[PDB]
Amino acid sequence: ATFEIVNRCSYTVWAAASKGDAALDAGGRQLNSGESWTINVEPGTKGGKIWARTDCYFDDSGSGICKTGDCGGLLRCKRFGRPPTTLAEFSLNQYGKDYIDISNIKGFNVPMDFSPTTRGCRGVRCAADIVGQCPAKLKAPGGGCNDACTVFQTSEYCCTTGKCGPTEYSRFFKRLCPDAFSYVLDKPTTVTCPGSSNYRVTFCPTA
Structure with missing residues (x-):
């Protein structure tokens, strides 16, 4: 299948695409x-994911650091990213x-549209200034708005036992997306789409 990843933001991102234990395609690239x-x-x-860093x-070989979303210091992600990362999931x-879904369960960093490029289903978006509003305790220094489970490590926020409810913090992400x-x-x-659909991930869409 085909993923076309597009940076409509006014700042450079480093896109990432992983399943967890391996890259997808080249695993990442400056934009x-x-x-x-397109990948x-x-x-x-x-359980595939696409995110921005x-x-x-x-450096020349590809090793380094990002302030949001870092995947073990690699330009070419073979693992998932450090929060806060807005997530395209599939x-x-x-x-x-x-x-297909978009997830703020690891936080938010970059607004995102994740739309099918082939018929039958509807896309999903989170484009609201989550980082501009973000509750004070969830801010990240480095950029973005952390999820509560990253900041506090409790069973309730992290839903550790398979039981939890919504929270003041989950609801701050759900008011905005x-x-x-x-x-x-x-x-x-x-969103359920036909098998073998193609997609577009647009960062900053409304940019």
């Missing part, structure tokens, strides 16, 4: 403002359907 990067992901991939440095060709997951047991805002 200056306006730049598009190939295999049918049937379960901000304020990175990488598992493809499940049993005849792909399923009802279509994105705000905590682990949120009512799902997942």
Whole structure:
């Protein structure tokens, strides 16, 4: 399948695409403002993620640091990213359907649209100034708005036992982005698409 990743923000991002234990395609790439990067992901991939990283440095080989979303110091992510990271999430060709979501369960850093480029289903977006509003205790120094489970490590925020409710903090993300997951047991805002759909991830969409 095809993912076209586009930086419509006015600042450079370093896009990342991983499943958790391996890169997807090249696993990451600089995107200056306006730049598009199309990747190939295999049918049937379960639990894929696409995110932005901000304020990175990488050297000639590719090793470095980013202030949000860092994946073990690699330009080319083979693992997931340090919060706060807004997340595009997907598992493809499940049993005849792909399923797409955007998640604020690791925080928010960059606004995002994650829309299908082929018919049948609707996209999802979170574009609100979460970082401008972010509750004081959830701010990150380095940039972004952390989730409560990152900041406090409690069973309730982290839904450790499979039981938890919404919180004042989950609800701060859900007031601003009802279509994105705000905590682990949120009512799902997942989208079911035909198997083998293609997609566009747009950072800063409304930019």
